Amino acid sequence: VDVGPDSVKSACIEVDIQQTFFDKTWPRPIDVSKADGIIYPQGRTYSNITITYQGLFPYQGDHGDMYVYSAGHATGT
Amino acid sequence: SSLILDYFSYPLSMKSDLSVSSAGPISQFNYKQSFSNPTCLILATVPHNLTTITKPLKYSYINKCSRLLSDDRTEVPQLVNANQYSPCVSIVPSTVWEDGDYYRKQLSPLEGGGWLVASGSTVAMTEQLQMGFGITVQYGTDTNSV
Amino acid sequence: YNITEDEILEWFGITQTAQGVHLFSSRYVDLYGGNMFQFATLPVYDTIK
Amino acid sequence: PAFMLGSSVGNFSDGKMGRFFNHTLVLLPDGCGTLLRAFYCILEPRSGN
Numbered sequence: 001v002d003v004g005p006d007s008v009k010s011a012c013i014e015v016d017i018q019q020t021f022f023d024k025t026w027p028r029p030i031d032v033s034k035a036d037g038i039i040y041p042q043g044r045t046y047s048n049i050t051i052t053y054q055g056l057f058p059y060q061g062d063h064g065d066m067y068v069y070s071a072g073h074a075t076g077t
Numbered sequence: 078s079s080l081i082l083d084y085f086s087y088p089l090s091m092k093s094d095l096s097v098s099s100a101g102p103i104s105q106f107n108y109k110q111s112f113s114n115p116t117c118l119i120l121a122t123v124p125h126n127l128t129t130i131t132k133p134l135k136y137s138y139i140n141k142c143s144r145l146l147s148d149d150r151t152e153v154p155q156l157v158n159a160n161q162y163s164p165c166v167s168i169v170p171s172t173v174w175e176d177g178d179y180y181r182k183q184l185s186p187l188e189g190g191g192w193l194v195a196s197g198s199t200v201a202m203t204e205q206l207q208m209g210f211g212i213t214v215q216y217g218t219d220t221n222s223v
Numbered sequence: 224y225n226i227t228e229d230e231i232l233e234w235f236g237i238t239q240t241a242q243g244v245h246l247f248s249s250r251y252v253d254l255y256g257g258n259m260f261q262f263a264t265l266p267v268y269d270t271i272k
Numbered sequence: 273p274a275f276m277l278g279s280s281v282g283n284f285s286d287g288k289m290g291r292f293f294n295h296t297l298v299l300l301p302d303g304c305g306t307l308l309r310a311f312y313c314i315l316e317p318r319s320g321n
């Protein structure tokens with residue numbers, strides 16, 4: 001129902017399937033003792049007390065969905 | 078803390094489907110209320126001294142939903158949740174043209190396969206248009222600020 | 224939104240409930256610490272799978 | 273990172289997949305990650321190279 005800025009030509013650049021450099025893992029897990037990746041309570045706050053809570057939570061030491069953005073081909077400049 | 082409203086074209090004719098434990102086609106395929114929070118339904122009518130709101134063409138709704146899989150033998154219904162829309166709405170258009178309209182779409186194997194099929198019917202307008210409002214209230218989502 | 228580019232680690236969370244799409248970040252609240260506080264809430268029409 | 277979201281998944285005509293029918297959500301970082309643009313709107317392709 002609103003506006004949209006159209007900039008440039010519809011001549012798309014070549015796109016490749018070259019995941020050989022991509023697939024190399026990193027051992028980067030999480031910690032619950034250091035409290036990595038926990039949503040703050042959405043309707044109440046507390047002080048110096050222990051609180052049971054029910055929410056949308058991850059697991060611990062998860063593998064994850066590790067990706068990284070790969071730059072394109074550039075011969076010189 | 079916060080308030081939520083929805084409004085829709087609800088004539089008085091199916092007002093008997095207002096109950097909390099209702100399992101009618103409007104309850105089964107269109108919407109189900111919030112069982113953990115208070116709610117209210119108000120069915121109002123267009124006043125004569127009010128032109129601020131328009132009148133649509135006809136009341137239209139759905140009364141069936143079925144996920145037939147690619148095996149053409151296994152069929153599974155859907156359960157609508159509170160303030161939620163099923164994937165039934167993702168394929169049915171914004172209105173239903175007449176009674177018994179069949180809306181179908183191909184399904185990928187990862188989501189089940191086959192053809193999702195749904196059936197829609199209709200109720201015509203009365204002398205004056207009636208609107209349905211549903212209010213739900215919540216205490217523990219944000220600051221008490223309204 | 225606007226955000227300051229930094230060198231310190233940051234976190235983001237995304238979820239969907241009946242009151243909409245919920246985006247959580249620590250930049251707006253805790254730069255040097257970290258917590259998923261609600262910095263955005265889309266009043267979405269549907270639940271995304 | 274950028275995120276595209278929908279409850280609809282379909283395959284393309286060539287055999288590839290990734291088609292998302294109806295309205296679709298897109299979150300995009302812009303300006304070397306300074307802008308947080310997002311829309312749940314209709315996306316369209318074109319048949320160029």
Ligand SMILES: *[C@@H]1O[C@H](CO)[C@@H](O[C@@H]2O[C@H](CO)[C@@H](O[C@@H]3O[C@H](CO[C@H]4O[C@H](CO[C@H]5O[C@H](CO)[C@@H](O)[C@H](O)[C@@H]5O)[C@@H](O)[C@H](O)[C@@H]4O)[C@@H](O)[C@H](O)[C@@H]3O)[C@H](O)[C@H]2NC(C)=O)[C@H](O)[C@H]1NC(C)=O
Nearest residue numbers: 032033034035041044045046047048049050051052053256
């Ligand atoms: C946040 O919450 C935490 C835990 O819930 C709090 O930590 C405890 O807080 C309570 C409340 O103040 C402390 O209880 C206090 O105990 C005092 C005991 O006095 C005697 O001991 C003193 C030395 O203390 C050490 O030795 C005793 C006995 O071995 C141990 O129990 C202690 O833990 C210490 O190791 C002496 O100096 C004194 O002369 C006495 O002989 C008592 O006097 C107080 O009235 C109170 O009841 C408790 O000790 C804390 N535990 C800790 C620090 O491990 C924390 O304070 C909260 N923070 C807030 C509220 O800001």
Ligand SMILES: *[C@@H]1O[C@H](CO)[C@@H](O)[C@H](O)[C@H]1NC(C)=O
Nearest residue numbers: 224225226227251303306307
């Ligand atoms: C974000 O950037 C704009 C333009 O650079 C600036 O005017 C605005 O104040 C910034 N946001 C905040 C919260 O300061």
